[PDB]
Design a protein around this motif. Sequence first.
Motif, PDB file in Angstrom:
ATOM      1  N   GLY C   1     -23.871 -62.628  21.803  1.00  0.00           N
ATOM      2  CA  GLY C   1     -23.373 -61.268  21.697  1.00  0.00           C
ATOM      3  C   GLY C   1     -22.366 -61.104  20.578  1.00  0.00           C
ATOM      4  N   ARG C   2     -21.702 -59.957  20.542  1.00  0.00           N
ATOM      5  CA  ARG C   2     -20.685 -59.701  19.534  1.00  0.00           C
ATOM      6  C   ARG C   2     -19.320 -60.095  20.091  1.00  0.00           C
ATOM      7  NH1 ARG C   2     -25.320 -58.384  20.096  1.00  0.00           N
ATOM      8  NH2 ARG C   2     -24.733 -56.476  21.211  1.00  0.00           N
ATOM      9  N   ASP C   3     -18.258 -59.816  19.346  1.00  0.00           N
ATOM     10  CA  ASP C   3     -16.906 -60.037  19.831  1.00  0.00           C
ATOM     11  C   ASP C   3     -16.227 -58.701  20.062  1.00  0.00           C
ATOM     12  OD1 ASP C   3     -14.353 -61.734  20.257  1.00  0.00           O
ATOM     13  OD2 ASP C   3     -13.765 -60.316  18.691  1.00  0.00           O
ATOM     14  N   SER C   4     -15.706 -58.519  21.265  1.00  0.00           N
ATOM     15  CA  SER C   4     -14.927 -57.342  21.615  1.00  0.00           C
ATOM     16  C   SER C   4     -13.459 -57.725  21.521  1.00  0.00           C
ATOM     17  CB  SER C   4     -15.279 -56.850  23.015  1.00  0.00           C
ATOM     18  OG  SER C   4     -14.841 -57.770  23.997  1.00  0.00           O
ATOM     19  N   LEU C   5     -12.763 -57.163  20.538  1.00  0.00           N
ATOM     20  CA  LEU C   5     -11.330 -57.367  20.394  1.00  0.00           C
ATOM     21  C   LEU C   5     -10.652 -56.012  20.305  1.00  0.00           C
ATOM     22  CD1 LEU C   5      -8.850 -58.868  20.289  1.00  0.00           C
ATOM     23  CD2 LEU C   5      -9.288 -59.528  17.919  1.00  0.00           C
ATOM     24  N   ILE C   6      -9.683 -55.780  21.182  1.00  0.00           N
ATOM     25  CA  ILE C   6      -8.900 -54.553  21.187  1.00  0.00           C
ATOM     26  C   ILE C   6      -7.455 -54.906  20.892  1.00  0.00           C
ATOM     27  CG2 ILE C   6      -8.109 -52.579  22.506  1.00  0.00           C
ATOM     28  CD1 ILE C   6     -10.658 -52.728  24.132  1.00  0.00           C
ATOM     29  N   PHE C   7      -6.886 -54.243  19.893  1.00  0.00           N
ATOM     30  CA  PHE C   7      -5.489 -54.427  19.531  1.00  0.00           C
ATOM     31  C   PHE C   7      -4.663 -53.424  20.322  1.00  0.00           C
ATOM     32  CE2 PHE C   7      -8.472 -54.923  16.106  1.00  0.00           C
ATOM     33  CZ  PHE C   7      -8.281 -56.225  15.702  1.00  0.00           C
ATOM     34  N   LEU C   8      -3.977 -53.906  21.350  1.00  0.00           N
ATOM     35  CA  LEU C   8      -3.168 -53.061  22.214  1.00  0.00           C
ATOM     36  C   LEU C   8      -1.727 -53.091  21.725  1.00  0.00           C
ATOM     37  CD1 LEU C   8      -3.108 -51.177  24.487  1.00  0.00           C
ATOM     38  CD2 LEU C   8      -2.735 -53.074  26.069  1.00  0.00           C
ATOM     39  N   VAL C   9      -1.203 -51.927  21.353  1.00  0.00           N
ATOM     40  CA  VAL C   9       0.125 -51.815  20.764  1.00  0.00           C
ATOM     41  C   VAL C   9       0.940 -50.815  21.567  1.00  0.00           C
ATOM     42  CG1 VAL C   9       1.453 -51.149  18.748  1.00  0.00           C
ATOM     43  CG2 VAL C   9      -0.667 -52.440  18.472  1.00  0.00           C
ATOM     44  N   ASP C  10       2.153 -51.213  21.937  1.00  0.00           N
ATOM     45  CA  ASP C  10       3.067 -50.317  22.621  1.00  0.00           C
ATOM     46  C   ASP C  10       3.582 -49.239  21.676  1.00  0.00           C
ATOM     47  OD1 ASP C  10       4.729 -49.121  24.434  1.00  0.00           O
ATOM     48  OD2 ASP C  10       6.256 -50.696  24.398  1.00  0.00           O
ATOM     49  N   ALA C  11       3.896 -48.080  22.259  1.00  0.00           N
ATOM     50  CA  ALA C  11       4.715 -47.071  21.592  1.00  0.00           C
ATOM     51  C   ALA C  11       5.751 -46.630  22.622  1.00  0.00           C
ATOM     52  CB  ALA C  11       3.875 -45.901  21.082  1.00  0.00           C
ATOM     53  N   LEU C  50     -14.016 -53.368  17.083  1.00  0.00           N
ATOM     54  CA  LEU C  50     -12.587 -53.516  17.311  1.00  0.00           C
ATOM     55  C   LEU C  50     -11.970 -52.162  17.625  1.00  0.00           C
ATOM     56  CD1 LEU C  50     -12.027 -55.665  14.118  1.00  0.00           C
ATOM     57  CD2 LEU C  50     -12.680 -56.491  16.384  1.00  0.00           C
ATOM     58  N   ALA C  51     -10.951 -52.169  18.485  1.00  0.00           N
ATOM     59  CA  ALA C  51     -10.325 -50.937  18.941  1.00  0.00           C
ATOM     60  C   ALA C  51      -8.809 -51.089  18.951  1.00  0.00           C
ATOM     61  CB  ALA C  51     -10.820 -50.539  20.336  1.00  0.00           C
ATOM     62  N   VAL C  52      -8.121 -49.954  18.823  1.00  0.00           N
ATOM     63  CA  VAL C  52      -6.663 -49.903  18.818  1.00  0.00           C
ATOM     64  C   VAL C  52      -6.204 -48.731  19.676  1.00  0.00           C
ATOM     65  CG1 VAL C  52      -6.276 -51.086  16.647  1.00  0.00           C
ATOM     66  CG2 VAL C  52      -6.805 -48.677  16.640  1.00  0.00           C
ATOM     67  N   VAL C  53      -5.230 -48.982  20.553  1.00  0.00           N
ATOM     68  CA  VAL C  53      -4.726 -47.988  21.492  1.00  0.00           C
ATOM     69  C   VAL C  53      -3.204 -48.046  21.497  1.00  0.00           C
ATOM     70  CG1 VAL C  53      -4.939 -47.053  23.843  1.00  0.00           C
ATOM     71  CG2 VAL C  53      -6.785 -48.445  22.887  1.00  0.00           C
ATOM     72  N   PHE C  54      -2.580 -46.940  21.900  1.00  0.00           N
ATOM     73  CA  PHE C  54      -1.133 -46.860  22.034  1.00  0.00           C
ATOM     74  C   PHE C  54      -0.766 -46.355  23.419  1.00  0.00           C
ATOM     75  CE2 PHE C  54      -1.585 -46.779  17.463  1.00  0.00           C
ATOM     76  CZ  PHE C  54      -0.597 -47.661  17.082  1.00  0.00           C
ATOM     77  N   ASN C  62      -7.690 -40.447  25.717  1.00  0.00           N
ATOM     78  CA  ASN C  62      -8.641 -41.316  26.392  1.00  0.00           C
ATOM     79  C   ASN C  62      -9.497 -40.487  27.338  1.00  0.00           C
ATOM     80  OD1 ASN C  62      -6.914 -40.816  28.530  1.00  0.00           O
ATOM     81  ND2 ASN C  62      -6.234 -42.927  28.779  1.00  0.00           N
ATOM     82  N   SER C  63     -10.733 -40.947  27.546  1.00  0.00           N
ATOM     83  CA  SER C  63     -11.672 -40.203  28.379  1.00  0.00           C
ATOM     84  C   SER C  63     -11.162 -40.086  29.806  1.00  0.00           C
ATOM     85  CB  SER C  63     -13.040 -40.880  28.360  1.00  0.00           C
ATOM     86  OG  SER C  63     -12.998 -42.106  29.067  1.00  0.00           O
ATOM     87  N   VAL C  64     -10.605 -41.172  30.339  1.00  0.00           N
ATOM     88  CA  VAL C  64     -10.026 -41.173  31.671  1.00  0.00           C
ATOM     89  C   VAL C  64      -8.830 -40.239  31.784  1.00  0.00           C
ATOM     90  CG1 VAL C  64      -8.417 -43.046  31.278  1.00  0.00           C
ATOM     91  CG2 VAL C  64      -9.460 -42.775  33.545  1.00  0.00           C
ATOM     92  N   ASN C  65      -8.353 -39.698  30.662  1.00  0.00           N
ATOM     93  CA  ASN C  65      -7.233 -38.758  30.639  1.00  0.00           C
ATOM     94  C   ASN C  65      -5.967 -39.380  31.215  1.00  0.00           C
ATOM     95  OD1 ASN C  65      -5.841 -36.461  30.062  1.00  0.00           O
ATOM     96  ND2 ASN C  65      -6.940 -35.130  31.496  1.00  0.00           N
ATOM     97  N   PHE C  66      -5.849 -40.700  31.121  1.00  0.00           N
ATOM     98  CA  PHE C  66      -4.632 -41.365  31.558  1.00  0.00           C
ATOM     99  C   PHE C  66      -3.513 -41.112  30.559  1.00  0.00           C
ATOM    100  CE2 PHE C  66      -6.623 -44.799  34.462  1.00  0.00           C
ATOM    101  CZ  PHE C  66      -6.698 -43.856  35.465  1.00  0.00           C
ATOM    102  N   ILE C  69      -1.332 -42.720  27.081  1.00  0.00           N
ATOM    103  CA  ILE C  69      -2.247 -43.721  26.551  1.00  0.00           C
ATOM    104  C   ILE C  69      -3.137 -43.047  25.523  1.00  0.00           C
ATOM    105  CG2 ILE C  69      -4.040 -45.384  27.058  1.00  0.00           C
ATOM    106  CD1 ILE C  69      -2.888 -45.728  29.770  1.00  0.00           C
ATOM    107  N   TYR C  70      -2.915 -43.380  24.259  1.00  0.00           N
ATOM    108  CA  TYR C  70      -3.636 -42.789  23.143  1.00  0.00           C
ATOM    109  C   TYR C  70      -4.400 -43.880  22.416  1.00  0.00           C
ATOM    110  CZ  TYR C  70      -4.414 -39.773  19.051  1.00  0.00           C
ATOM    111  OH  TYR C  70      -4.975 -39.030  18.042  1.00  0.00           O
TER     112      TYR C  70
END
Lengths: 246, 156, 505, 23
Positions: C1-11, C50-54, C62-66, C69-70
């Motif tokens: 498969g591929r590699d799923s890497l998400i860069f999770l960064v605080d704000a 790859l993904a990045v969230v704040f 976000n779809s979950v509307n949490f 969390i951006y």
Amino acid sequence: KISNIFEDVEFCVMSGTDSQPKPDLENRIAEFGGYIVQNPGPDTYCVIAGSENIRVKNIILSNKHDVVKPAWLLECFKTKSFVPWQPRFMIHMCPSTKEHFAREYDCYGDSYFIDTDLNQLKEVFSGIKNSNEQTPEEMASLIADLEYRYSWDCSPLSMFRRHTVYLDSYAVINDLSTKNEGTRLAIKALELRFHGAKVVSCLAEGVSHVIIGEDHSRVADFKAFRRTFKRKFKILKDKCELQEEN
Amino acid sequence: IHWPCRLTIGSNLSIRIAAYKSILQERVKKTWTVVDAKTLKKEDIQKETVYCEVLKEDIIQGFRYGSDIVPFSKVDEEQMKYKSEGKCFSVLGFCKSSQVQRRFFMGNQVLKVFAARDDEAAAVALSSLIHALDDLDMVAIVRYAYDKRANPQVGV
Amino acid sequence: GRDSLIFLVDASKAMFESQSEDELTPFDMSIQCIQSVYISKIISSDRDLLAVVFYGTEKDKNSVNFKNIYVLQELDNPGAKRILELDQFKGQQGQKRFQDMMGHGSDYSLSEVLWVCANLFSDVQFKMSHKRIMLFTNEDNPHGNDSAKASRARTKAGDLRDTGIFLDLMHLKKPGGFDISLFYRDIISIAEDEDLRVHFEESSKLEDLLRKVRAKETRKRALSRLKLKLNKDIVISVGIYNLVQKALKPPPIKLYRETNEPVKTKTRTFNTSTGGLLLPSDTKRSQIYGSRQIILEKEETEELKRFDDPGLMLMGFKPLVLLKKHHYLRPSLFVYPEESLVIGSSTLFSALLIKCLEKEVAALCRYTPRRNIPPYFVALVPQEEELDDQKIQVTPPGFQLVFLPFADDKRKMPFTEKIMATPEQVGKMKAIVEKLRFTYRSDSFENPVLQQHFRNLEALALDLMEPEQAVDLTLPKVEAMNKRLGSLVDEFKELVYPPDYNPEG
Amino acid sequence: CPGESLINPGFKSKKPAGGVDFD
DNA sequence: ATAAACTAAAAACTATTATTATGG
DNA sequence: CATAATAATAGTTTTTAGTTTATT
């Protein structure tokens, strides 16, 4: 279209986001019927130079395009009239543009036909390289000759920086090395370089003006070397510290 | 061809040399001629690359940058191409003969290197270096560049 | 498969404070790391996502509307648009631009962010070989405050580990140091845990994260699932690999002048004599020898290229000592047994490997890659299994397929008469080589052509004003060599070259 | 994981390029 | 006489779809 | 000569051998 002036001329808008965002400039061009191309075609007369990129450098190296700043094209827009090309937004130009600017201007923005003003004179001058490297006396003679030919001696600055005045800045004249505190010899030297009369404090023959200095104790020296001079001392008065050039 | 060149060690050494292809890939220099099946004429045959329709003056070359596509003119690539020097073949260093493995033998040909044609002192230097390398179990790391358009190469 | 890497960064303002303003804030330097990672992935793996969230930021996306969390970018192949979007916040006042358009300050639930990134993983409709998420902070105190949310977060993290998600955490700049284990002591998925100090270090592995490695690194697959036939019936499935492979530039793409559309190209073969149109069956291949223009069909050429079927025809055993170094044709390939088609293949392969290692002989084999190909004789060198100090198999066990050239593969050379030299000159060369000796490593060089190629690619992709310049490792250290040697070259030249020799001419 | 490029999982660690280093 | 690209890359990993061994 | 069927086929990416065009 609204201003069909911009139609039929291909524009390579490779960077517009310098004054307006590049898509906005493309919108304005399209509403004016201009042709937007993402690569410089052979018929791309001019290229809109927004941000600086390596592609900008290539365009410069490839003598096929006209470097156009977005502000000049904004002038063309807001005027609703196509501004003629000028060398103050233009960086790299085709030889046709080179001869165009050599015709309409002196290649500095100074036209050969349409007269000047303060703004364009200042811009042409600044565009010309900063020019002060020669000896003060050569350019002093140049200023004097231009004042004679152009009646520019009428400047209030025209009597202490370029030609024909004598003074005593030294305890012994013909001795350019003696210096004594207790007077304003330094200030006299500092003034002798301002208005347009030459810094001279040595025994000379062709000098015509002799002026008693702020070091008035050298009237003895002034008169003693006046015998070697062929010009007499006047009753003294820019032109009024202790002076008689009239 | 005769490939005259100079083995360059630092800047103090430059020996005229003649290195030729010793072992190399083989293939006939005469290829096929796709002719007609009825008149047996190639001149009647013709290929026609067509771009859609547009000509070759409406097209540029591009390059897929990850998920993105990048316009990239050939003049620009040549300007920005890393350009080496031609017929420059200098020595890069000396490493142990056991350090290298034939598994890393690149290229499709084997090049045998002689000194200059009829240069006695060049041959003397070559033989002295050969004997030294042999006695030291020694192999020489060199940079190869055939001509100006040649890519620089690192070879043993 | 591929590699799923998400860069999770605080704000949550935990990245805006700085030890000093001459040092990068915990925020912007992380942006630079992420951009470097994007570039490296572009160089290496296009197909990865790859993904990045704040989180903790005042607003959310976000779809979950949490809330708080951006997501900045979702699981996708890296794009220059994404990279420049990060760049607009990269560096000084880039965090100010962020504050202006994004802001921060609010709190969050690590359970909530774990839920969100799990949603991101569930979103992709593509198989991921790895489930990696990368967390950027210097602080575990937010959930270090309330025990309930911390317990919920660690329960969620354990659940995600059960799902196969591998969480990784970085040491970030902090004036008071990272001070680990306030929350994160066992909330990290780790295969080898060695971090237990407070770790006032502002970095853990950010150096290579920022390091721009230039390689494609294609995933492993056998070059051929060929069949090794001993005589005619003792056949084993065998895997062939290009353990090295000369890399080349990606091909150019035909794009339009104004729209840069990938141009559909078509080269019709047609009769120019009549202006008509030809067919593959409408033409014949020809070659003219002497007075005879011999006419054939291409197919007939293909069947006259048919000699042997795809496979391995063992031709015998030759001692390894009988191998000439200069007898090289093209880079060798690796041989591995396959039990996919023949069971017992690996046992026999191991037996043969050990036996050829003992007797020090090579199994010369007639090799056919695939049909319509003249079989070649190749020597298979028993290749041992070599493990490094870390017991990592640096040289796989198997065989080294080296191509044995034919009679015509040589070329006649205008040789020159053999000339000797004084042993003193030999000693001079020995000493000089000892001066200029250097230790060899496999990865000691890169192609400067391809390097600068990628440099230009990155520059235009980032529409830079000026490209970074690739360093040419292949250029010799001429000054260093002269420093190392001195006048030894001059002494040897006088020993050999008379004082009239033209250096080149 | 030891001896593995964390950037490319399943791929060994990538050393810095380096160059000729005289001994 | 071709040392760069000549020109289109012969090949599996990893994912699906119509077969019918049959269900009746 | 009917029907919860079922599964052997295929179709995407890699990386070889064809070739220009100067190169001496």
